[PDB]
């Protein structure tokens, strides 16, 4: 769009994943799809994915780029299974307290084959970003109800449905199979959420969806049948 806040944000984070490159730490979720994948809304949390502990303090202070004023990093958290920290930082725009917040789970880890590179950046594959979406907003152990999961859900149907298989497809079309129940589900999240009010259609989004996943669902089907036919 995008504020000045939100492009000295964006390149805070930039500096942080390049840095993070030698390392096994990998990027994912929302603002894996930002800065990986060309995701068209804001994302400002940084979530990891790592097999092993690293010096994640002294990455982040040596990637601070020029511009960006690194006042403080609180350690939240960290344990054998869980990172959680507040970088908060100001600019030369502005020296108003921002908080970046960097997270990472350990031995959640994908294997390094499960790791792409994208603009020198470590982030996890498509299909694992929909993996966790579906999870987290439809039939994980623990889900939640942020508007944020429909619309990347949405976007990934719509400019990554290579990406889905069947059982990805299946739970999509399963979750997205009534769009006046999302709507219903979603729309004081939409409202109350910045990163969404100004640029997304909730009950387009939610009509699209449903009938997208049903398309990609139908195709695999398609495609498995006719397989079939053809190994005879």
Partial sequence: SLSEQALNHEKLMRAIVKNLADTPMVLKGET????????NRFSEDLDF?????????????SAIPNGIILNDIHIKKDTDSVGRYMVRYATKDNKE?????????????????????????RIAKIERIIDNKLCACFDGEHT?????????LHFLAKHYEEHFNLDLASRLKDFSKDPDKLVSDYL???????????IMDLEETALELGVMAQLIHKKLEKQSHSLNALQE
């Fill in 32 to 39: 894996a799809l930002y800065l990986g994948y060309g995701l």
């Fill in 49 to 61: 994915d790592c097999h092993k502990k690293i010096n994640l303090l002294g990455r982040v202070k």
């Fill in 97 to 121: 307290e921002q908080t970046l917040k960097l997270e990472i789970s350990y031995r959640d880890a994908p294997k390094e084959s499960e790791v792409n590179v994208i603009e020198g950046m």
């Fill in 144 to 152: 939640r109800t942020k508007a944020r999961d429909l619309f990347d």
């Fill in 188 to 198: 004081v999240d939409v409202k109350l959420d910045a990163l969404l009010n100004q």
